[PDB]
Every structure is written in C-alpha cells, then in structure tokens.
Design a binder for these strands. Structure first.
Ligand SMILES: [K+]
Ligand SMILES: [Mg+2]
Ligand SMILES: [Mg+2]
Length: 135
RNA sequence: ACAU
DNA sequence: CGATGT
C-alpha cells in the first residue's frame, strides 16, 4: 500500500546475464548511495540481487539499524528467507568469484541473526526501485 | 503466469 | 530478441 520511506533499497546491475555483476544500496528517502560492490566479472542477475540483500543485512546490523530492506527480486527475497541461493549458474573457474561470494553470504546467514524485514518493492505501483541502475 |  | 528464477 504505502512505501516505507525509512528503509534501504538495493538493486543489481549487469552487463549481460550471465555477465558482469555489480550492486548497490541507497537510502530510499534521498537516494544517497550507502554501499556499492566492485563489479564481479561473471555472475547472474539473481546472484547479484541476493548478494545485495545480504550485504544490506550486514550493513544495517553493523550500524544497529532496524530499517527494512526493499528489493524488487521475488527470487532473491526467497533465497534469503531460505538461506540458500538456488542458482543454476555453472560452478567453474570463471564463475569461482561470484560463487565464493554467494557461498560466503549463505555462511554469514547461517551464523548470524537479524530481524530486518525484507520487503518487496512494488515496481508496478511505485516505479523503479531507488537503487536501480537505469539500464 | 509472476518477479527480474 | 536473449537469460535468470519461483
Ligand atoms: K537498470
Ligand atoms: Mg532488481
Ligand atoms: Mg534495476
């Protein structure tokens, strides 16, 4: 119904899918960029969406913030809920970096607690998520 | 179908 | 048009 403006919004950007993957988190209210991941040479959209949420959880926990996180990714929200990224991406030498980050993100979820609500950004009603890359 |  | 996902 209503946007929760006191929140963190995250999104992935890519060049190809699979392809180069980056992600960022922004203050939903102001669009201030709060974190940005250095581009990862090969990954999928959904792996990047997943990493962005987990990074947001870690960012907010470190700062003792109870803000929710918005993502537009039905897939990544479910993977975080399950603590399991069910990616189809081949595990080989060229995908080793993204898979290391995904494995490490799952490991973090399995060793830490959080109450952060992870909310679906309703693109159809509200337009593009504030963390979008514009492409 | 829906979400990217 | 193609790909990633539930
Ligand atoms: K974009
Ligand atoms: Mg997105
Ligand atoms: Mg986007």
């Amino acid at each position: 119904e209503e946007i929760i403006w006191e929140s963190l919004s995250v999104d992935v950007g890519s060049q190809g899918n699979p392809g180069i993957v980056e992600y960022k988190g922004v203050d939903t209210k102001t669009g201030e960029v709060l974190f940005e991941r250095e581009p990862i040479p090969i990954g999928t959209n959904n792996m990047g969406e997943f990493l962005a949420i987990v990074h947001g959880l870690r960012y907010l926990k470190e700062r003792n913030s109870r803000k929710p996180i918005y993502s537009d990714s039905q897939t990544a929200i479910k993977w975080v809920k399950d603590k399991k990224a069910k990616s189809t991406l081949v595990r080989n030498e060229e995908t080793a970096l993204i898979w290391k980050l995904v494995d490490e993100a799952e490991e973090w979820l399995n060793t830490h607690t959080y109450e952060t609500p992870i909310l679906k950004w309703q693109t159809d009603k509200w337009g593009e998520i504030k963390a979008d890359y514009g492409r």
